[PDB]
Structure 1
């Protein structure tokens, strides 16, 4: 319930291989050639599926 030993730099880093976060699943609006999230409304043009909002 208490550490018997201090985690070394290497073992710390070997845990931290997976804490990362991923590039977001985005792409360019067909209307504005400007990056946006798939299946989401573009915040720049305010448009979705060829239809303003």
Structure 2
């Protein structure tokens, strides 16, 4: 329950190859003209489905 040998740099980076985080799923609101999350209410023009809320 304790490391026998210390971890090199190569093995550390090899393990960390999968610790990234993904890109957001966004596109551009037709009314706003700038980016927003799909299936979400855009915060600039305050509209969803072409209707203000």
Question: TM-score normalised to the size of structure 1?
Answer: 0.91
Cα displacement string for residues 9-33 of structure 1 (whole angstroms, at most 9, x for unaligned residues): 1111111111100110001111111
Structure 1 residue runs of 5 or longer lacking an equivalent are none
C-alpha distance in structure 2 between counterparts of 1:10 and 1:44, whole Å = 46
| Count of aligned pairs | 53
In the other structure, the counterpart of 1:20 is 20
Question: TM-score normalised to the size of structure 2?
Answer: 0.91
Which structure: greater helix fraction? 2
In the other structure, the counterpart of 2:48 is 48
Structure 2 residue runs of 5 or longer lacking an equivalent are none
1:4 offset after TM fit, Å? Answer: 0.6
